[PDB]
Amino acid sequence: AIGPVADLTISNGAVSPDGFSRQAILVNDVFPSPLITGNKGDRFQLNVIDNMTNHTMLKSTSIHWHGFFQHGTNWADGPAFVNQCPISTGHAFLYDFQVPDQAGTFWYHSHLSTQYCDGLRGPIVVYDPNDPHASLYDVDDDSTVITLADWYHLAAKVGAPVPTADATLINGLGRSAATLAADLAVITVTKGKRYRFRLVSLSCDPNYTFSIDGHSLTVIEADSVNLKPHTVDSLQIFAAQRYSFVLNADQDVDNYWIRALPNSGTQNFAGGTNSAILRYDGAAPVEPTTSQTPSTNPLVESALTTLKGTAAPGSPTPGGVDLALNMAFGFAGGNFTINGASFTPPTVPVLLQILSGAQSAADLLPAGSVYSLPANADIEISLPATAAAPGFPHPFHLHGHVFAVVRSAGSSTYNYANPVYRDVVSTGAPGDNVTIRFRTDNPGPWFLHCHIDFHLEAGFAVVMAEDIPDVAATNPVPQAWSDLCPTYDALSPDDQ
Numbered sequence: 084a085i086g087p088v089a090d091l092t093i094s095n096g097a098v099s100p101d102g103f104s105r106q107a108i109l110v111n112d113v114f115p116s117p118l119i120t121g122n123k124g125d126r127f128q129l130n131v132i133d134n135m136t137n138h139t140m141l142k143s144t145s146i147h148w149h150g151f152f153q154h155g156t157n158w159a160d161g162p163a164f165v166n167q168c169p170i171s172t173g174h175a176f177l178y179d180f181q182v183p184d185q186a187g188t189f190w191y192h193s194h195l196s197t198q199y200c201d202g203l204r205g206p207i208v209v210y211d212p213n214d215p216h217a218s219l220y221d222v223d224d225d226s227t228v229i230t231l232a233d234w235y236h237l238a239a240k241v242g243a244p245v246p247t248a249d250a251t252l253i254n255g256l257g258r259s260a261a262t263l264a265a266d267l268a269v270i271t272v273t274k275g276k277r278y279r280f281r282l283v284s285l286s287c288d289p290n291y292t293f294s295i296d297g298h299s300l301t302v303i304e305a306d307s308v309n310l311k312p313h314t315v316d317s318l319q320i321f322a323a324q325r326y327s328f329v330l331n332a333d334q335d336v337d338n339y340w341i342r343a344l345p346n347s348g349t350q351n352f353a354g355g356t357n358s359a360i361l362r363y364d365g366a367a368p369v370e371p372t373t374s375q376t377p378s379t380n381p382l383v384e385s386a387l388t389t390l391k392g393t394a395a396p397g398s399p400t401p402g403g404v405d406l407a408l409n410m411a412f413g414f415a416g417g418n419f420t421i422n423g424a425s426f427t428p429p430t431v432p433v434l435l436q437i438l439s440g441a442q443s444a445a446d447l448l449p450a451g452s453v454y455s456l457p458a459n460a461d462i463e464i465s466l467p468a469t470a471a472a473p474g475f476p477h478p479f480h481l482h483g484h485v486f487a488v489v490r491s492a493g494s495s496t497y498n499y500a501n502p503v504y505r506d507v508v509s510t511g512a513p514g515d516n517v518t519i520r521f522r523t524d525n526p527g528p529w530f531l532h533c534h535i536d537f538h539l540e541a542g543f544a545v546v547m548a549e550d551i552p553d554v555a556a557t558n559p560v561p562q563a564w565s566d567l568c569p570t571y572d573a574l575s576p577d578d579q
């Protein structure tokens with residue numbers, strides 16, 4: 084409902100999405116943050132005007148447009164101290180980029196520290212006027228976007244380092260243990276119509292097992308990649324993932340519970356927690372009293388495939404690529420490690436280090452955390468789960484790319500012929516060996532990290548410095564970008 088050219092003014096104020104009042108982050112004076120839309124191929128010009136005054140939730144900011152490749156615009160990707168210095172308070176900064184060849188469901192969020200958990204995070208839809216699945220539904224609009232989010236009554240830097248959520252929010256509304264009469268979100272449908280619901284996880288931490296009483300869900304898109312339609316009666320969505328599903332509203336006129344069970348915190352639906360309302364036109368304005376039936380056809384990621392049936396890059400055998408890397412997870416001194424290194428943000432953003440003459444992974448900071456990738460090549464990365472990295476299952480995200488999930492969590496098999504492609508994948512439980520492949524078609528430094536935001540904060544990330552020799556020529560930067568670091572570095576600490 085705004086975009087693709089729009090101002091996004093960021094400020095602080097009180098919100099009460101679960102009927103408990105707390106300070107948080109507002110975007111264009113609202114919470115939850117507003118939906119942005121455009122069409123396939125559009126240029127997006129989003130002018131981020133930072134007016135925040137609260138240092139505990141951070142006065143500075145930086146925005147990632149999650150799922151967008153940013154080819155030629157690596158300076159606009161978002162991550163603080165990888166692709167830019169943060170925008171300073173009392174300043175604005177224009178993200179100006181295009182989205183060739185992409186359409187689906189995305190989202191934006193702060194990518195500075197754990198700031199998005201304090202409320203800067205909203206959905207984005209990029210519509211396809213020739214969507215291959217358009218004929219499966221009648222309604223696809225602002226009222227078919229469903230967000231899931233975790234909410235905490237203490238701020239990200241006020242509560243525990245890995246806190247437990249006080250409420251799940253669905254479209255920005257939900258109940259906690261103490262606010263059992265708080266307003267629930269309502270999603271309205273008309274009997275006889277078919278809906279493209281675009282489900283996006285804005286979570287900082289928990290994954291949700293999502294279902295709607297009485298209704299099956301036909302999944303047709305995962306993380307902005309078109310799928311062959313695949314009907315399920317429930318699905319598990321990890322932080323930062325998206326699915327589109329068609330719901331055919333062909334049940335009796337009634338209210339039905341929409342359920343989103345987290346894997347930690349309150350794990351039941353007593354008093355309508357973890358829930359929202361699917362309301363048919365004509366039904367009474369009351370809560371559902373429908374019953375959950377056991378899921379006997381849950382989404383299984385290894386059973387999903389792309390609409391085109393695209394092979395994984397490379398040849399069908401392990402190590403069948405130009406470069407194979409394994410990421411060994413661990414945890415010590417309160418920090419996560421990958422291959423023995425913990426990510427600390429460097430003071431010079433990784434992109435600026437490359438523009439300033441850094442040539443190799445060994446040159447780039449932080450030391451031990453940066454991997455050089457060859458240009459125009461195929462890559463395979465395995466991310467084996469281990470109890471040495473507490474808080475599994477960890478959902479890893481690769482910026483600047485979609486990847487083929489050749490091996491999924493909970494599966495023993497490898498699929499090179501027709502695997503799902505996506506951009507956030509659960510790395511599963513000890514014994515799994517989640518393995519992805521992608522092509523280096525996009526020069527620039529790109530983050531690869533756990534999307535549980537509290538774990539990224541604790542160092543659980545690396546940077547893929549893809550095609551270093553071509554980064555500068557491929558990504559010419561605007562002078563407003565070049566002015567971010569001197570403005571930020573001049574702040575005193577209390578103004579950060």
Ligand SMILES: *[C@@H]1O[C@H](CO)[C@@H](O[C@@H]2O[C@H](CO)[C@@H](O)[C@H](O)[C@H]2NC(C)=O)[C@H](O)[C@H]1NC(C)=O
Pocket residue numbers: 105106107137138139140236237238241242
């Ligand atoms: C800045 O934001 C923080 C975090 O939201 C606010 O922190 C609150 O601090 C009070 C007073 O100490 C506590 O009782 C609350 O529990 C805190 N809230 C949260 C959500 O953790 C702080 O009040 C904000 N500053 C201003 C001026 O509003």
Ligand SMILES: *[C@@H]1O[C@H](CO)[C@@H](O[C@@H]2O[C@H](CO)[C@@H](O)[C@H](O)[C@H]2NC(C)=O)[C@H](O)[C@H]1NC(C)=O
Pocket residue numbers: 401407408409465466467515516
């Ligand atoms: C996860 O899979 C990776 C990739 O197959 C395994 O690492 C390979 O292990 C074999 C057997 O030691 C070596 O020959 C290769 O050199 C390794 N490849 C890389 C790129 O390092 C890894 O051992 C698997 N981990 C688990 C727990 O199954």
Ligand SMILES: [Cu+2]
Pocket residue numbers: 147149192323480534
């Ligand atoms: Cu993200």
Ligand SMILES: [Cu+2]
Pocket residue numbers: 147148149150480481482483
């Ligand atoms: Cu991302």
Ligand SMILES: [Cu+2]
Pocket residue numbers: 474476477478533534535538539543
């Ligand atoms: Cu994690």
Ligand SMILES: [Cu+2]
Pocket residue numbers: 147162194480482530532
């Ligand atoms: Cu990221």
